[PDB]
Amino acid sequence: PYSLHLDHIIQKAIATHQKRDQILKDTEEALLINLRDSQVLQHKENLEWNWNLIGTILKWPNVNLRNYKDEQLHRFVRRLLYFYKPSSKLYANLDLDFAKAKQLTVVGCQFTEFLLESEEDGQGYLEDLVKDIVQWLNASSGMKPERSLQNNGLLTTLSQHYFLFIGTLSCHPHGVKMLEKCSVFQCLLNLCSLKNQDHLLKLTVSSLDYSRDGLARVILSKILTAATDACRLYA
Amino acid sequence: PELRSTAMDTLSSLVFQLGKKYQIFIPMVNKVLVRHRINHQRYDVLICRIVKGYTLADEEEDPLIYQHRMLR
Ligand SMILES: Nc1ncnc2c1ncn2[C@@H]1O[C@H](COP(=O)(O)OP(=O)(O)OP(O)(O)=S)[C@@H](O)[C@H]1O
């Protein structure tokens, strides 16, 4: 898979096919060495961080912000949250064909699932991130009277990858609950009815997860039954 | 005890070419690594991307293809 949506789809299908029919500890020391060499806490300048090391801290098994209560890790996740939010205008402004574009998106997906990996301590960051995402998507979709037109910013920058975060938020059973705690599914339900933007329905119909029964199949059925004819054909 | 860093760098440069073909060797080397408290940062990055998935296209890739695509 060349793309990152089809990659997540095939990985989720392989994961559920493996899950239907049935590592190092590094407590506090090596974690501190890895977050020291990661260069996130030394300086706030973006694009100079060591993103391989960030991916290795976020994808290590037993570090999940629930068993290692250290203030440096909270500083690290707060800096990554402020970088990844679209309101701060840092990640959502880098254009396509970038030198490191797929890596930042992969790190973002594993970061927003790492936040969900602590279901009792990872609310204050995840709720803020998904509220900022739905705020940006309501601002760009046309639910506001300011401009109702930002197709020139979604189509050529990395800010179109914020559906993939919702995609990797939609697979887990605790993910749909957090996604419905904010007004995300209703926002896509109102997005289904508009007539001017057809690319957003292509983005949301190829990102969500339809493995289990819920509100994700209702959006797919609403696009399939009542939508634009081109979007209906693509669905 | 003195050839640890050079052998770990050689091991990291070797397992960068091997994709999921090295996943069978990880519990064999992990005993020797935790026995003498050997920590290498690039090897940790590589085995973190090997055990837990990074993407699907980069794992199990011809290394000459990568060297050609990075030379350009
Ligand atoms: N480009 C940036 N990347 C990360 N953080 C930034 C960036 N630019 C400004 N910041 C600020 O850094 C804040 C997060 O830092 P904290 O998690 O509070 O760690 P900190 O070291 O206490 O920060 P300060 O500035 O010393 S209070 C962001 O919410 C912003 O206030």
UniProtKB/Swiss-Prot annotation, chain A:
- Which residues bind ATP per the record? 46, 75, 79
Question: This protein's superkingdom?
Answer: Eukaryota
Task: Write out the PTM section of this UniProt entry.
Answer: Phosphorylated by MTOR; when part of mTORC2. Ubiquitinated by the SCF(FBXW7) complex, leading to its degradation by the proteasome. Deubiquitinated by USP9X; deubiquitination stabilizes RICTOR and enhances its binding to MTOR, thus promoting mTORC2 complex assembly.
| UniProt-annotated location(s) | Cell membrane; Endoplasmic reticulum membrane; Lysosome membrane
Annotated segments matching region Ribosome-binding domain:
24-73
Q: Main role?
A: Component of the mechanistic target of rapamycin complex 2 (mTORC2), which transduces signals from growth factors to pathways involved in proliferation, cytoskeletal organization, lipogenesis and anabolic output. In response to growth factors, mTORC2 phosphorylates and activates AGC protein kinase family members, including AKT (AKT1, AKT2 and AKT3), PKC (PRKCA, PRKCB and PRKCE) and SGK1. In contrast to mTORC1, mTORC2 is nutrient-insensitive. Within the mTORC2 complex, RICTOR probably acts as a molecular adapter. RICTOR is responsible for the FKBP12-rapamycin-insensitivity of mTORC2.
Similarity comment: family membership: Belongs to the RICTOR family.
Record text on subunit structure and interactions: Component of the mechanistic target of rapamycin complex 2 (mTORC2), consisting in two heterotretramers composed of MTOR, MLST8, RICTOR and MAPKAP1/SIN1. The mTORC2 core complex associates with PRR5/PROTOR1 and/or PRR5L/PROTOR2. Contrary to mTORC1, mTORC2 does not bind to and is not sensitive to FKBP12-rapamycin. Binds directly to MTOR and PRR5 within the TORC2 complex; interaction with MTOR is enhanced by deubiquitination of RICTOR by USP9X. Interaction with MAPKAP1 is not enhanced by RICTOR deubiquitination by USP9X. Interacts with CCDC28B. Interacts with NBN. Interacts with SIK3.
Q: What is the name listed in the Swiss-Prot or TrEMBL entry for this protein? A: Rapamycin-insensitive companion of mTOR
Which part of the full protein is shown?
A: 489 to 732 of 1708
UniProtKB/Swiss-Prot annotation, chain B:
Write down the superkingdom of origin: Eukaryota
Disease named in the record:
Smith-Kingsmore syndrome: An autosomal dominant syndrome characterized by intellectual disability, macrocephaly, seizures, umbilical hernia, and facial dysmorphic features. Focal cortical dysplasia 2: A form of focal cortical dysplasia, a malformation of cortical development that results in medically refractory epilepsy in the pediatric population and in adults. FCORD2 is a severe form, with onset usually in childhood, characterized by disrupted cortical lamination and specific cytological abnormalities. It is classified in 2 subtypes: type IIA characterized by dysmorphic neurons and lack of balloon cells; type IIB with dysmorphic neurons and balloon cells.
Tissue expression as described in the entry? Expressed in numerous tissues, with highest levels in testis.
Reported modifications of this chain: Autophosphorylates when part of mTORC1 or mTORC2. Phosphorylation in the kinase domain modulates the interactions of MTOR with RPTOR and AKT1S1/PRAS40 and leads to increased intrinsic mTORC1 kinase activity.
| Domain remarks | The kinase domain (PI3K/PI4K) is intrinsically active but has a highly restricted catalytic center. The FAT domain forms three discontinuous subdomains of alpha-helical TPR repeats plus a single subdomain of HEAT repeats. The four domains pack sequentially to form a C-shaped a-solenoid that clamps onto the kinase domain.
Function text? Serine/threonine protein kinase which is a central regulator of cellular metabolism, growth and survival in response to hormones, growth factors, nutrients, energy and stress signals. MTOR directly or indirectly regulates the phosphorylation of at least 800 proteins. Functions as part of 2 structurally and functionally distinct signaling complexes mTORC1 and mTORC2 (mTOR complex 1 and 2).
In this UniProt entry, which cysteines form S-S bonds? none
Spell out the family assignment given in the record's similarity comment: Belongs to the PI3/PI4-kinase family.
Q: Where are the HEAT repeats?
A: 23-59
Q: Which residues carry this modification: N6-acetyllysine?
A: 52
* Organism per entry: Homo sapiens (Human)
Its quaternary organisation is: Part of the mechanistic target of rapamycin complex 1 (mTORC1) which contains MTOR, MLST8 and RPTOR. The mTORC1 complex is a 1 Md obligate dimer of two stoichiometric heterotetramers with overall dimensions of 290 A x 210 A x 135 A. It has a rhomboid shape and a central cavity, the dimeric interfaces are formed by interlocking interactions between the two MTOR and the two RPTOR subunits.
**What stretch of the whole protein does this chain cover?**
1167 to 1238 of 2549
Q: Where in the cell is it found?
A: Lysosome membrane; Endoplasmic reticulum membrane; Golgi apparatus membrane; Cell membrane
The protein depicted here goes by the name: Serine/threonine-protein kinase mTOR
